[PDB]
Structures are given as structure tokens and as C-alpha cells.
């Protein structure tokens, strides 16, 4: 309310295959959001290890917050929103479509996604952000389209849930209007990036074979753990 920088944990889905940590600050009027690879490895427990998506978020999305608080000690997660690929669409329809500037030509290869601003709807949007090979930018490309869908939904988010269990958040219906009032950084200062690191295999008595893990790049992680703290208040 007092225009104090916060943070929000966006989750997509059981488990969370899409994790984005976003922190807003009216002062610097900008949004910093970093994407954590679903398989990212997090050190928590007396030997306990696991991927953030499955291994975690298996006791409520709040679990993911915890995993995100472990992967990044300093940074505090003020809020969080987790939606399924269903409530996601109903969230794009109920909001009345989404407008997105598609700078890449993703022709009728999959849909008539002409270049430029190509407004979409629930399903159209889910198909947009889900594209893979078609986008010559490979992985980065999805980080783009993902971003687009976030700003597209936010620049329209009066408040209602036609949806229900397919939507989840800890925000107050009487506190959503607050950020949607004082805060307007969703304009043009949204710089998103994806936590770097390297993947590695790891055996597991349970299965009998190695499992996949994305080992975070320490120096990179720190740059971020530090950058986020810089967006709130290094204290």
C-alpha cells in the first residue's frame, strides 16, 4: 500500500512445471522476473535432494515458495499465484482475450499467429506460449512468449473468479485493487531472464536409475539472489 517493493511467485501447472519469480518496485518503476528451470536442483535437508517442480509443490503451492526460498535464501516471496493450463485459459477469456506483440513470425505453422500485435484468447494463448520448435529462438523464445502472456493478462487484471480450484493465490481480494492502483510498472520496465546453470544425472534408489537435474550456476544464482534483494531492500 505504502508503495513498498514486493515480490510474487507465478506458478504454472501434480506439480509446477513453470516457475517465475517476479518482484515489483514503484520507486524504480520496473518489474524483475527470473525463470527457474522446472528441474532446478535445490539443497534442502540432511541429504534430501529434488527438483523444484515435482519433488516440491507436493504439499501445496506454498511448498514451492519454500523451495524458492531455499534456492534463494535472501529473497522473500510476498505473494504467489498458481494456475493450471485450464484455469489459465478461463483466465484469458474471462479477462476478455489478451493482446500480445509477437515480434517473431510464427506463421500458420501452428496457427495464424501473424507478426506484430496478435490478440488472443484462452486456448489461443495456451498454444502460443506452448510453441517449441517453430520458434527459431529455441528456449529463449519461450521465455519471450511467456513474458508476453504475463503482461497481456496483467494489463487487464472487475476482479472475478468464474474459475475456482484451477486458480490459486494468497492475495487478498481487498488487496489486489491496491497494487492495481499504486503500481503501474507493468508498463515498460519488465525485464525477465532464466536462471542459468547446467543439467546433470543422479541415481535414485527409488527408481533404480539416474534422474535429471538442473544444477544452478552459483555465480549466476548469486547475481540474481543479489539482484532481487536489490529490487526490494538489501537489509
Amino acid at each position: 500500500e505504502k508503495k513498498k517493493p514486493f515480490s510474487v511467485l507465478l506458478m504454472g501447472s501434480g506439480r509446477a512445471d513453470t516457475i517465475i519469480l517476479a518482484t515489483a518496485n514503484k520507486q524504480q518503476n520496473a518489474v524483475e522476473m527470473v525463470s527457474i528451470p522446472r528441474d532446478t536442483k535445490v539443497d534442502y535437508g540432511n541429504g534430501d535432494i529434488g527438483k523444484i517442480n515435482a519433488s516440491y509443490s507436493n504439499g501445496g503451492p506454498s511448498g514451492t515458495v519454500s523451495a524458492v526460498e531455499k534456492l534463494m535464501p535472501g529473497v522473500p516471496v510476498d505473494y504467489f499465484i498458481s494456475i493450471n493450463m485450464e484455469g489459465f485459459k478461463d483466465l484469458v477469456d474471462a479477462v476478455g482475450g489478451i493482446t500480445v506483440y509477437n515480434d517473431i513470425d510464427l506463421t500458420e505453422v501452428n496457427s495464424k499467429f501473424v507478426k506484430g500485435n496478435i490478440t488472443l484468447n484462452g486456448t489461443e494463448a495456451l498454444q502460443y506460449v506452448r510453441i517449441r520448435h517453430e520458434d527459431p529462438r529455441g528456449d529463449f523464445g519461450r521465455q519471450d512468449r511467456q513474458r508476453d502472456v504475463i503482461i497481456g493478462i496483467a494489463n487487464k487484471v472487475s476482479i472475478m473468479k468464474a474459475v475456482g480450484d484451477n486458480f490459486q493465490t494468497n492475495m487478498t481480494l481487498t488487496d489486489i485493487t491496491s497494487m492495481a492502483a499504486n503500481y503501474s510498472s507493468v508498463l515498460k520496465n519488465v525485464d525477465s531472464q532464466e536462471l542459468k546453470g547446467e543439467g546433470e544425472m543422479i541415481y535414485s534408489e527409488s527408481y533404480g536409475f539416474d534422474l535429471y537435474y538442473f544444477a544452478p550456476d552459483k555465480t549466476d544464482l548469486e547475481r540474481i539472489i543479489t539482484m532481487f534483494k536489490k529490487s526490494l531492500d538489501i537489509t
Side-chain angles (χ1 to χ4, degrees), residues 34-35 46 68 82 98 112 129 177 179 194 208 231:
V34 171
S35 162
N46 313 158
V68 173
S82 67
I98 294 302
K112 63 296 160 300
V129 68
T177 331
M179 38 187 63
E194 189 193 54
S231 71

Side-chain angles (χ1 to χ4, degrees), residues 11-13 82-90 126 163 165-168:
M11 287 166 247
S13 321
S82 67
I83 53 178
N84 59 157
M85 295 330 151
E86 236 281 66
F88 170 63
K89 285 143 64 171
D90 306 336
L126 189 53
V163 64
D165 317 71
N166 295 195
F167 182 72
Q168 184 99 193

Side-chain angles (χ1 to χ4, degrees), residues 21 29 93 117 121 136 145 227 230:
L21 215 176
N29 208 75
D93 298 310
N117 286 101
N121 61 51
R145 313 196 240 86
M227 178 231 300
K230 193 157 81 169

Side-chain angles (χ1 to χ4, degrees), residues 9 19-23 31-37 72 143 146 191-196 220 224-225 227-228:
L9 174 53
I19 312 181
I20 282 80
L21 215 176
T23 70
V31 183
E32 287 306 311
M33 39 177 239
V34 171
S35 162
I36 313 298
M72 322 183 127
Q143 199 57 208
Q146 184 181 90
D191 310 307
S192 153
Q193 49 177 297
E194 189 193 54
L195 173 53
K196 287 186 161 191
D220 198 54
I224 289 183
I225 287 174
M227 178 231 300
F228 270 165

Side-chain angles (χ1 to χ4, degrees), residues 24-203:
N25 159 221
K26 185 60 191 60
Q27 284 71 88
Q28 297 172 58
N29 208 75
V31 183
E32 287 306 311
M33 39 177 239
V34 171
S35 162
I36 313 298
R38 78 202 80 99
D39 298 284
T40 294
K41 161 172 147 185
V42 55
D43 182 45
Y44 166 81
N46 313 158
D48 205 54
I49 290 297
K51 7 238 285 302
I52 337 299
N53 77 294
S55 302
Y56 288 82
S57 182
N58 288 182
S62 69
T64 302
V65 186
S66 316
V68 173
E69 295 177 305
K70 291 295 297 67
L71 175 72
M72 322 183 127
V75 200
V77 189
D78 287 6
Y79 299 86
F80 71 76
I81 305 173
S82 67
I83 53 178
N84 59 157
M85 295 330 151
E86 236 281 66
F88 170 63
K89 285 143 64 171
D90 306 336
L91 175 60
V92 179
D93 298 310
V95 68
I98 294 302
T99 172
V100 294
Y101 182 67
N102 173 28
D103 51 338
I104 195 283
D105 171 36
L106 294 175
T107 98
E108 292 133 35
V109 202
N110 29 206
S111 181
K112 63 296 160 300
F113 291 132
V114 63
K115 185 206 289 182
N117 286 101
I118 177 165
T119 299
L120 304 173
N121 61 51
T123 304
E124 298 186 301
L126 189 53
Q127 163 177 44
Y128 179 65
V129 68
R130 282 191 123 296
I131 290 185
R132 242 190 161 68
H133 286 169
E134 288 71 295
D135 187 308
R137 295 172 294 171
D139 254 4
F140 172 80
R142 299 212 302 290
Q143 199 57 208
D144 189 88
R145 313 196 240 86
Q146 184 181 90
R147 187 187 109 164
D148 288 310
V149 181
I150 297 290
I151 303 304
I153 289 193
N155 293 333
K156 298 179 78 92
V157 174
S158 199
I159 50 95
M160 226 28 103
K161 296 73 196 306
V163 64
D165 317 71
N166 295 195
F167 182 72
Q168 184 99 193
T169 179
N170 80 306
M171 307 186 134
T172 329
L173 34 126
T174 72
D175 79 8
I176 309 174
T177 331
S178 206
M179 38 187 63
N182 245 309
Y183 304 91
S184 65
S185 314
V186 70
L187 221 299
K188 267 308 302 166
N189 234 290
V190 189
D191 310 307
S192 153
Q193 49 177 297
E194 189 193 54
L195 173 53
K196 287 186 161 191
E198 198 186 331
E200 53 151 306
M201 293 293 150
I202 301 181
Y203 184 76

